[PDB]
C-alpha cells in the first residue's frame, strides 16, 4: 500500500509537469525545475524501489530459514 501510494504520487508529479509542459520547457524562469525534476524523481523512485526490494529480500530470507530450521528439528 505504501509503495503503491508513493508510486501514484510520483506519477502525479509527472502529470504536473506534463499538464504544464509548455511552461517548464520554454519559460527560463522554470529552468531549474526542468533540469532537476528528473534527478528528484529518480531519487524518489530509488527510495520507493529500494524499500520494496529490501523488504522482498528479507521476506525471502525469513521464509527459507523457517523451512530449513524446521526440518532439522523434526
Amino acid at each position: 500500500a505504501t509503495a503503491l501510494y508513493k508510486s501514484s504520487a510520483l506519477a502525479g508529479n509527472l502529470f504536473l509537469y506534463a499538464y504544464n509542459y509548455n511552461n517548464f520547457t520554454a519559460n527560463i524562469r522554470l529552468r531549474t525545475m526542468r533540469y532537476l525534476f528528473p534527478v528528484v524523481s529518480l531519487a524518489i523512485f530509488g527510495n520507493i524501489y529500494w524499500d520494496y526490494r529490501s523488504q522482498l529480500v528479507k521476506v525471502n530470507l525469513f521464509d527459507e530459514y523457517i523451512q530449513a530450521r524446521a526440518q532439522e528439528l523434526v
Binding site: 504544464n20 509548455n22 511552461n23 520547457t25 520554454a26 519559460n27
Partner: protein, 54 residues
C-alpha cells in the same frame, strides 16, 4: 478614379508560438489566476427571491 481601386493580397499568417496557448499561457500574471479563481468559486450566486434565505 477612386472607385477603380483594388486591394493587395496580405500575408497568410504571422508566427505561431508552439508553446503558448490561451488555456496554458507561457508567461504568468494575476489575470489568468483570476480567471481560474472565478471558475472555481463560480459566478455570483444571484438570488431571485424577495427575502434572504437566513
Amino acid at each position: 478614379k477612386e472607385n477603380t481601386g483594388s486591394m493587395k493580397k496580405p500575408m497568410a499568417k504571422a508566427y505561431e508560438h508552439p508553446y503558448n496557448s490561451e488555456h496554458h499561457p507561457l508567461n504568468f500574471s494575476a489575470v489568468k489566476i483570476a480567471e481560474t479563481f472565478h471558475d472555481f468559486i463560480g459566478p455570483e450566486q444571484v438570488s431571485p427571491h424577495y427575502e434572504s434565505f437566513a
